[PDB]
Amino acid sequence: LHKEPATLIKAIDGDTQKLMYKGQPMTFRLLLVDTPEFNEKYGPEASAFTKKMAENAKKIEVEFDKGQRTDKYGRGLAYIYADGKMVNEALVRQGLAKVAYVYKGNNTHEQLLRKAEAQAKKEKLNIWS
């Protein structure tokens, strides 16, 4: 997989954000994770965590997997990096997302993320508290 450049247009919630990619505005949905909706427990905390990570970053990058690059809603499906650190992994490591939506063909980072989930659950963080 390869990282490609993007810039933040605006935060949306824990697992979606509006980025500019190849010069066009797109909503991205983070691969392999599911944050709570803003109206659910830890939804606000997730939204804040992703908003902070993306807004503080000097460099945002998007990395597509081997499979579908857009979902049925027209959202881009990617791993997103904020100064080289993966947002998807970070959310999971903090107990603010669960590994979820693991579809064959787009699951390159599955075991990285499951290792993070195990550590979050071991620490009883957030969702696992």
Ligand SMILES: Cc1cn([C@H]2C[C@H](OP(=O)(O)O)[C@@H](COP(=O)(O)O)O2)c(=O)[nH]c1=O
């Ligand atoms: C993460 C992800 C979600 N989806 C679709 C599946 C779910 O469909 P349904 O809308 O029919 O439930 C929805 C969940 O996204 P959200 O968690 O953002 O709601 O997004 C994909 O198709 N591919 C993906 O990789």
Ligand SMILES: [Ca+2]
């Ligand atoms: Ca969600």
